Structures are given as structure tokens and as C-alpha cells.
Amino acid sequence: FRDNGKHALIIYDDLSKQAVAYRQMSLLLRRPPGREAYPGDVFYLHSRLLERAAKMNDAFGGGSLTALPVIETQAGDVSAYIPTNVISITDGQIFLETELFYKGIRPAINVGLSVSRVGSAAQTRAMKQVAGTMKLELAQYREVAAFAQFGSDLDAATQQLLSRGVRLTELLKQGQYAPMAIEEQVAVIYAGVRGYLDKLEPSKITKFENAFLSHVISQHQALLGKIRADGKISEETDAKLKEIVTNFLAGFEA
Amino acid sequence: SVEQEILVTGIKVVDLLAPYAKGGKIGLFGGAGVGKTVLIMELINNVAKAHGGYSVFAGVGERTREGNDLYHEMIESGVINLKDATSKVALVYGQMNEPPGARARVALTGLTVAEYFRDQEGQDVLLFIDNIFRFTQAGSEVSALLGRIPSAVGYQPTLATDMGTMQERITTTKKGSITSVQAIYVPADDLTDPAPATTFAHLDATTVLSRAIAELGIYPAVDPLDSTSRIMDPNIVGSEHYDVARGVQKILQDYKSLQDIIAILGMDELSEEDKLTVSRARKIQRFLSQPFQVAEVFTGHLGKLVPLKETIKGFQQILAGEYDHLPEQAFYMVGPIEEAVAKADKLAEEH
Amino acid sequence: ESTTSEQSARMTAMDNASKNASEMIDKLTLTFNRTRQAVITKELIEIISGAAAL
Amino acid sequence: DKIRGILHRTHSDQFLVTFKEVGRKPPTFGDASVIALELLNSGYEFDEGSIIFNR
Amino acid sequence: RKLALKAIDWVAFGEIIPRNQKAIANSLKSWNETLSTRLAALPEKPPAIDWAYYKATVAKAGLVDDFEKKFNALKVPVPEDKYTALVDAEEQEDVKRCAEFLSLSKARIEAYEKELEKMKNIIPFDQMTIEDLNEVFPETKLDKKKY
Amino acid sequence: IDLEKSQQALVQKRHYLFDVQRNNIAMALEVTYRERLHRVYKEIKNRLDYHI
Numbered sequence: 020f021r022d023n024g025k026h027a028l029i030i031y032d033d034l035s036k037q038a039v040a041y042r043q044m045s046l047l048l049r050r051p052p053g054r055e056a057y058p059g060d061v062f063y064l065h066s067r068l069l070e071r072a073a074k075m076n077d078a079f080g081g082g083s084l085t086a087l088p089v090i091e092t093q094a095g096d097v098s099a100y101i102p103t104n105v106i107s108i109t110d111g112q113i114f115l116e117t118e119l120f121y122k123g124i125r126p127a128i129n130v131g132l133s134v135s136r137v138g139s140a141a142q143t144r145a146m147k148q149v150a151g152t153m154k155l156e157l158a159q160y161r162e163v164a165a166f167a168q169f170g171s172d173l174d175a176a177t178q179q180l181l182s183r184g185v186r187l188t189e190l191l192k193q194g195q196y197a198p199m200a201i202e203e204q205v206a207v208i209y210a211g212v213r214g215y216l217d218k219l220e221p222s223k224i225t226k227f228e229n230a231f232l233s234h235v236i237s238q239h240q241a242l243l244g245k246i247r248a249d250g251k252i253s254e255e256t257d258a259k260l261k262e263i264v265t266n267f268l269a270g271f272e273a
Numbered sequence: 274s275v276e277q278e279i280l281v282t283g284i285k286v287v288d289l290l291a292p293y294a295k296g297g298k299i300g301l302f303g304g305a306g307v308g309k310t311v312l313i314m315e316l317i318n319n320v321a322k323a324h325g326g327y328s329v330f331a332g333v334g335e336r337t338r339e340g341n342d343l344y345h346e347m348i349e350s351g352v353i354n355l356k357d358a359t360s361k362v363a364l365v366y367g368q369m370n371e372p373p374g375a376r377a378r379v380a381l382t383g384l385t386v387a388e389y390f391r392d393q394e395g396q397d398v399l400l401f402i403d404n405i406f407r408f409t410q411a412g413s414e415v416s417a418l419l420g421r422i423p424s425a426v427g428y429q430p431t432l433a434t435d436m437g438t439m440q441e442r443i444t445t446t447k448k449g450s451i452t453s454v455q456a457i458y459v460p461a462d463d464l465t466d467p468a469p470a471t472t473f474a475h476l477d478a479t480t481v482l483s484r485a486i487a488e489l490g491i492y493p494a495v496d497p498l499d500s501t502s503r504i505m506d507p508n509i510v511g512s513e514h515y516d517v518a519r520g521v522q523k524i525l526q527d528y529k530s531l532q533d534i535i536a537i538l539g540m541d542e543l544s545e546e547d548k549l550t551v552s553r554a555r556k557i558q559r560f561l562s563q564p565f566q567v568a569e570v571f572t573g574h575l576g577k578l579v580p581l582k583e584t585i586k587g588f589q590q591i592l593a594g595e596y597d598h599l600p601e602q603a604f605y606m607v608g609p610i611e612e613a614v615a616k617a618d619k620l621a622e623e624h
Numbered sequence: 625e626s627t628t629s630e631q632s633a634r635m636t637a638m639d640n641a642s643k644n645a646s647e648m649i650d651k652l653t654l655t656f657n658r659t660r661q662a663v664i665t666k667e668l669i670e671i672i673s674g675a676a677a678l
Numbered sequence: 679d680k681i682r683g684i685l686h687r688t689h690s691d692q693f694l695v696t697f698k699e700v701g702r703k704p705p706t707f708g709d710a711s712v713i714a715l716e717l718l719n720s721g722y723e724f725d726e727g728s729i730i731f732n733r
Numbered sequence: 734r735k736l737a738l739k740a741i742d743w744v745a746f747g748e749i750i751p752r753n754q755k756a757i758a759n760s761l762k763s764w765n766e767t768l769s770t771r772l773a774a775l776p777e778k779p780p781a782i783d784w785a786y787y788k789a790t791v792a793k794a795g796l797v798d799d800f801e802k803k804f805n806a807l808k809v810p811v812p813e814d815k816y817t818a819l820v821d822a823e824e825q826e827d828v829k830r831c832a833e834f835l836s837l838s839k840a841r842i843e844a845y846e847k848e849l850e851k852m853k854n855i856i857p858f859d860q861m862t863i864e865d866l867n868e869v870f871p872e873t874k875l876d877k878k879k880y
Numbered sequence: 881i882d883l884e885k886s887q888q889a890l891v892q893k894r895h896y897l898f899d900v901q902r903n904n905i906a907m908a909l910e911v912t913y914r915e916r917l918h919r920v921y922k923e924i925k926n927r928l929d930y931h932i
């Protein structure tokens with residue numbers, strides 16, 4: 020599909036069971052072992068599989084291939100042999116913890132340790148504008164997360180930084196098998212990063228969101244066709260979205 | 274086969290947070306001396322006499338004494354009958370006095386008798402296996418004389434292939450169904466050892482036992498924040514059971530992060546709002562412990578069996594706050610929530 | 625006066641309890657790093673000696 | 679509290695009253711009136727005294 | 734099929750103002766959002782029934798085609814519209830009652846407007862009268878003004 | 881002034897919400913007729929799926 024101008028996606032589930040099925044073949048063929056009885060060429064096994072993912076240019080067709088490998092650590096130690104081979108080959112990691120899974124954060128993505136080194140050059144113009152401040156807003160919250168357990172004698176800026184960090188977190192939680200659209204995603208983030216939620220109670224942020232999304236699908240369908248097709252969010256759509264979340268927030272609690 | 278169900282047992286920790294399933298592979302983890310043989314003796318007590326079809330017990334590499342306390346606790350309960358043709362249990366035994374070439378072909382002999390009932394007949398079969406770590410270990414002893422370089426910490430190079438060659442016959446096909454409970458020894462309390470940490474791919478419901486709970490007196494010591502299931506699903510267990518299970522794990526995990534403050538500050542210097550989420554969590558820890566039936570000679574207490582509809586309704590009321598007027602001791606080793614207040618008054622009068 | 629005398633000594637006595645807990649946290653980081661290397665070294669010898677005698 | 683807890687052994691019979699829940703919230707003038715009122719209407723008619731504190 | 738439009742459910746239609754009955758008006762907008770998504774779940778036209786492939790793939794004939802002959806010429810009668818008229822009937826009586834403010838208070842507007850005409854007349858000259866100033870500021874019977 | 885507009889406020893309020901009650905019940909018959917045409921195809925698709 021990459022050779023013929025099309026696009027593709029591949030998922031290896033999982034690559035940490037290929038290095039084990041290859042170690043057994045080595046030690047039965049009497050090859051010299053190494054660290055944790057892996058052979059000397061387990062780096063050459065995973066490198067020439069992930070380097071086949073490429074973004075071709077227009078003279079060859081314009082195809083692509085995207086690769087998502089899954090790697091299982093043991094007790095959260097990424098400094099093992101195979102969790103350090105595949106980390107240094109690829110671009111960025113998504114680090115799912117087990118502590119956040121039981122504290123209510125589902126999907127339990129830790130955004131403190133997750134990176135991507137293509138950066139913001141793969142986001143659309145609508146998503147890039149709102150999430151650039153959200154990434155800065157959440158990163159200021161994780162500095163002051165250790166003051167939440169006993170904090171009431173702090174500055175009003177610090178009480179504000181805690182107040183936005185909890186409510187931005189509730190927007191990030193998501194049920195299973197419910198994938199959204201980018202035009203619906205940018206609207207929910209726009210409702211939170213502007214300041215339209217600092218008076219709503221932190222337990223109601225989930226109920227407010229499922230109510231607000233079913234509204235704008237049926238009653239504002241002509242605005243979510245001018246962010247899908249436009250790609251960016253203009254000044255005309257900035258005012259048009261502004262009275263929408265003010266109309267819904269006014270009469271909401273019923 | 275692809276269909277999923279729920280098989281009710283009667284244990285409060287198991288049915289609430291990690292439900293078992295008909296025709297599904299179940300695992301019992303934990304170290305040495307925490308209760309893997311007793312908890313697998315409990316499911317022959319509850320499940321095997323109310324079951325229609327037959328049952329097979331394969332004992333692989335355990336003490337030869339404990340194969341006699343099964344032959345003498347199954348004659349006096351009438352499951353094995355020595356006088357006619359109405360018995361319901363077969364037994365296959367290769368214990369820890371055998372040569373190590375014979376502790377690695379007994380588990381293949383257990384699931385050969387249990388394959389006859391599923392295939393040549395059509396009945397619903399159970400299968401209990403204890404222990405199954407002694408299938409891996411008994412192949413790591415004959416290995417170096419067969420001419421093989423060792424892998425990581427000392428196991429054979431063909432570790433995850435002959436394990437996966439036995440564990441693909443214990444399945445539910447379109448000709449029958451095999452429920453299977455297995456006890457899995459974890460060596461010196463380390464679930465990152467290569468023998469227990471590759472059985473996880475073959476199990477639907479894992480029940481991780483723990484020595485840090487058992488040394489509190491909470492019995493059965495099942496870790497709630499480490500046990501999973503594939504049917505903890507609000508489309509299968511309903512939306513009322515689902516928001517109760519996650520409501521218990523959220524208040525237990527938030528209780529863990531509060532213990533780091535009490536070590537420096539103290540209990541009394543906390544606020545009144547989180548002096549309540551501790552006291553709600555401590556009543557949830559103690560309410561999970563249930564007096565077993567086959568552990569009467571340890572305890573002297575009686576055997577309780579709480580149904581499924583009562584386990585949810587017991588835990589809604591501790592979370593909502595309908596029992597904030599009782600001390601913690603009123604829930605220790607009780608059955609349903611009705612006996613939690615009858616035990617509360619009987620402690621009061623002796624002041 | 626007494627609630628100012630007390631609230632300033634809570635500031636100092638919680639400051640030396642984070643210097644002494646960060647002075648202790650570097651000395652256990654070196655011992656963790658000597659012991660992390662010594663286990664990769666030790667279980668590498670057991671594989672080599674197991675293959676050489678075979 | 680921590681005055682009474684230290685002196686609970688040697689001088690448990692020379693206490694008059696003890697006032698707890700002090701220092702969580704900031705002190706005010708009403709709490710200086712609650713203490714000084716109960717120092718009078720106790721039944722102990724005294725004639726000198728002294729106060730010790732940390733200036 | 735058939736589908737008619739509606740008006741704006743923006744300001745008036747959620748502010749019906751009952752006796753503190755904002756909950757009943759909130760439920761009125763909640764039915765319009767639910768039915769519009771249920772109308773967005775299914776289209777106006779259903780799928781088509783291929784008849785020719787039914788004869789060959791289900792070629793055990795007779796029992797297959799007799800159900801396909803009876804279910805083809807069937808009819809689907811929709812539900813009745815008996816409650817559709819009586820709910821629209823009470824709108825005709827209340828709309829005749831809602832103009833009572835436009836009927837009764839219209840004279841109350843002009844009487845207040847005529848009161849602004851005579852109020853200009855009374856003030857007059859500074860030194861005007863001792864009885865024309867005795868309309869706004871009051872007088873009474875014996876022993877009213879205590880102070 | 882404030883009681884003149886109080887006349888006109890209730891005559892634009894009432895005619896909006898008395899046609900919302902026309903169209904909130906109008907959608908209730910389309911979605912129960914569209915699901916009547918759809919369901920009669922569903923229970924004849926079961927027989928088109930069974931005998932194969």
C-alpha cells in the first residue's frame with residue numbers, strides 16, 4: 020500500500036515476544052550469548068523492521084506507512100535490554116501506568132513522560148491553536164500536584180492553577196470503543212481552556228460533556244462542517260462558538 | 274467458542290472485583306504459604322457438588338500427605354463412592370518424590386482424561402491443577418544433560434514453547450466446555466520471574482494473593498488492586514455492578530496515597546474530610562474477609578456463602594455512608610451485611 | 625506571639641527534614657548503581673560458564 | 679493539648695481546666711474571651727499569677 | 734418520506750414560565766434533542782429487497798417463497814393521531830387568554846399616560862394654590878398624622 | 881414603558897412554544913414510521929439469512 024500511492028497502518032502486538040522466540044532459536048543453534056542470553060544481533064533484528072516505515076515523496080507515489088509497536092515492561096523498568104533497544108529506534112513513547120488506571124484516569128496515559136519528536140507539525144490548525152495552551156496549562160498543574168492533599172493557605176493564582184488542572188483532566192477521560200472526531204474534540208477543549216468551567220463542580224464535568232456533545236451534533240451541524248473542511252478556526256467561527264457554550268452553560272442544570 | 278457467561282461462587286472478593294466465567298481459564302497466584310491449596314479446596318466444596326457433569330483433579334509436584342487429605346475428604350462427603358458406580362471425580366497424582374522426568378508428564382495425563390469427557394462425550398467438565406509451577410521447574414532439571422545452553426535466570430531455552438503447547442489444549446471448543454482453576458506458585462514473591470510472568474497470556478481471570486494482606490489477618494488475602502477479569506464489562510455484568518467495582522478500587526488506591534502523609538504528620542492532624550475516606554476504606558478492607566468452610570479447623574467459625582445480589586448491596590451502603598455509626602470490628606469475618614449490625618450490638622453490652 | 629513563634633519553627637524544622645532526606649537520597653543512589661551493574665555482571669558469568677562446560 | 683500531654687504524669691492533680699483545639703485556625707479575640715470567662719467562674723479564687731509564652 | 738421544519742428553540746421556547754416550573758420547560762427542549770438524533774439514526778428510505786437472489790440461494794422452494802410472497806404485499810399502519818389534536822387544542826384556548834394582558838393593561842397604559850398629562854398641570858407656578866397641591870400630598874380625617 | 885413591553889413579551893413567547901409542541905410531537909410519528917418500514921425489512925432478512 021506504500022508502493023502504490025496509498026496509506027497504511029500496522030500494529031505489532033507485541034514485539035517483546037519476538038525477541039524471546041528468536042532467543043530460543045539462537046541458543047539451540049549454538050550461537051554466542053550476551054546480556055540476558057540474547058544474541059549479539061537483537062538490535063539488528065528490530066532496527067530493520069521499524070526502518071521500513073517511511074513517508075514517501077511525490078515522485079515515487081506519495082505513499083506512507085505508520086508503525087505502532089507494543090512493548091511490555093516488567094515492574095515499570097524501561098532500562099532493560101529490549102525496552103532500551105526499541106526506545107532508541109523509534110520517535111516517541113506513550114507510557115500507560117497502572118497507578119492512574121485505578122485512580123480513575125482511563126485511558127491512563129502519563130503525559131509527563133510521553134513525548135513525540137515530530138512535534139506540533141502533525142496537528143491540524145484547529146487542534147494546534149487550543150492545545151498549545153492546554154499543554155502549557157497541564158504542565159503547570161503537574162508542578163503543583165503535591166500541594167492538593169493539604170492546601171487551603173495558598174495564593175489565589177495557585178488555587179486557580181489547581182482549579183483548571185482538575186477540570187482539564189476530566190475532559191481527557193474517555194470510555195472504551197468511543198472514538199471521537201477532531202471537530203468535536205476541538206470544541207470540548209475550547210470549552211475548557213478559555214475559562215468556561217471554573218464555576219462548574221468538578222464531579223459534573225463528565226455529565227456536562229456528554230450533554231454538550233449531543234447538542235452540537237444535531238443543533239450546530241453547520242459549524243462542525245466549517246472546522247472539518249476549513250481545517251483552521253477563524254475569527255468568524257471564534258465568535259460563533261463563543262455564544263454557543265454561553266447559551267448551554269446558562270440553562271444547563273435541570 | 275466465543276460466548277462468555279458468569280459462574281457464581283459465593284466468595285465476596287472474587288465475585289465483586291474479578292468475576293469468574295464458565296469455560297474460562299482461571300489463575301491463582303501468590304507465594305508460598307498464603308492459601309493457594311485452601312482456596313482451590315474451597316471451589317471443590319462449593320462448585321463441584323452443585324455441578325452436573327464430572328470433574329478431574331490433577332496434582333503435580335506437591336506433598337504426598339495432601340493427596341491423602343483429599344482421598345479422605347471425598348469419601349465422607351460422598352463424592353468418591355467405594356461401593357457402587359455413582360462417583361463423579363477422577364484423580365491423577367504425580368507428587369514431589371518422583372524423578373524429574375515424571376513431574377513433567379503428569380499434567381499432560383490430567384488433561385487427557387479431561388479431554389475424553391469434552392470430546393467423546395459432551396458434558397461440562399471442570400479441572401483443578403495444583404501445582405503448575407512444578408511443570409516448568411521439572412523441565413529445567415533434565416535440560417542441561419540434554420545439551421542446552423541456559424537462558425535467563427536458569428530456565429531452559431524452550432520455556433515458553435512447551436508451556437504454550439500444554440495451555441492450548443485447556444480450552445472451550447464447539448464440542449464441550451472446560452472450566453479450569455489452576456494454582457501457580459510465584460518463587461519468593463516476584464511476579465517478574467520468567468515462569469509466572471508468561472502464564473499471564475493464557476489466563477482470563479487472575480487472582481493474585483499476597484503476603485502483605487495475609488499478615489494483617491484479612492483472609493482470603495486477595496489483592497484487589499492486582500486482580501483482573503475479561504468480563505468486568507458494563508455490557509456483561511450490568512451498569513450497577515460495574516460502578517460499584519471501580520468505586521471500591523478508587524477508594525482503596527486513594528487510601529494508599531494517604532498513608533504516606535500519616536507517617537510524618539499523624540492521624541489527628543488530618544482534615545475531617547479525609548478522616549472519613551480512611552474510615553470508609555478500612556471498613557471495605559475488613560468486609561472483604563469471609564470465613565471459609567474448609568477452614569473450620571483453623572478458625573472454629575462457621576462457613577458463609579454470600580450470594581451475588583447481596584455482595585453489591587452490601588458495598589453500596591458502606592460507600593454512601595449508611596454505616597458510619599459502627600466501629601471497624603463489626604465487619605470482620607462476617608457473611609452478608611445483616612450480620613454486621615447483629616455483631617455490632619453484641620460487642621456493646623460487655624462494657 | 626505564640627502562633628508566630630510556632631509557625632516559624634515549623635518552617636525551619638520541615639526544611640532540615642528535606643535536606644537530610646536529600647543527603648540520604650544520593651548515597652543510596654550510588655549503592656543502587658553499583659548493585660545494578662553487579663547483577664548484570666554476575667548473571668552473565670553463569671551463562672558463559674554454563675555453555676563452556678557443555 | 680501538648681502541655682497537658684507532657685504534664686500528665688508529674689502534675690495530673692494540679693490542673694484546673696485544659697483547653698484543646700487550639701492552633702488549627704488562627705486565634706481571635708473571642709477565644710481570648712472564652713478562656714478568660716471560664717478562669718473566673720470555676721470556683722477557684724486566686725490572688726496572684728503569671729503567664730509563660732514564646733515571644 | 735415527509736419531514737417538516739420548525740421554529741427557533743432559542744429564547745422563548747425554554748422560558749415558558751410556569752409557577753416556578755422551569756423543569757417542565759426544560760423537559761420540553763429535552764424531547765426535541767432526543768427525537769432529532771433518533772431521526773438522524775435511521776434514514777428516510779430503508780434497504781432494498783433483492784428478490785432474484787432469494788430464489789437461488791434458498792433454493793429449497795415453497796416454504797422460502799411463501800413467506801416472501803406474504804411479507805412483500807404487507808402494509809405497516811402507523812400509530813393514531815388522537816393525542817395530536819387535544820394537545821394542539823389547549824394552545825388555542827391559552828393563546829386567547831394570553832392577550833388578556835394586551836386587552837386589560839392597554840387601558841392601564843393610557844390611564845397612566847393620561848396621568849402624566851395632569852401631573853404636568855398641577856405643579857404650575859411656584860406660588861400656585863393651596864388646594865391644587867392638596868391632591869398629591871395628602872389630607873385625612875381627624876387624628877391621622879401622629880407626629 | 882416596562883409594562884407596555886410586558887404585554888408584547890408574552891405574545892412572542894406563546895406563539896413560539898405553541899408550535900414547538902406541534903413539532904415535538906411531529907418528530908414522534910416520523911421516527912415510529914421510519915422504524916416501521918425498517919423493522920419489516922429486518923424480520924424478512926432473518927429468513928434470507930437462515931436458510932442459507
Ligand SMILES: Nc1ncnc2c1ncn2[C@@H]1O[C@H](COP(=O)(O)OP(=O)(O)O)[C@@H](O)[C@H]1O
Nearest residue numbers: 305306307308309310311312492493494565568
Ligand atoms: N481460609 C484461609 N484464610 C487465610 N489463611 C489460610 C486459610 N486456610 C489456610 N490458611 C493458611 O495458609 C497456610 C498455607 O495453607 P495451604 O493453602 O495449604 O498452603 P499453600 O498455599 O502454600 O499450598 C496455612 O499456614 C494456613 O494458616
Ligand SMILES: [Mg+2]
Nearest residue numbers: 309310335403
Ligand atoms: Mg500447596
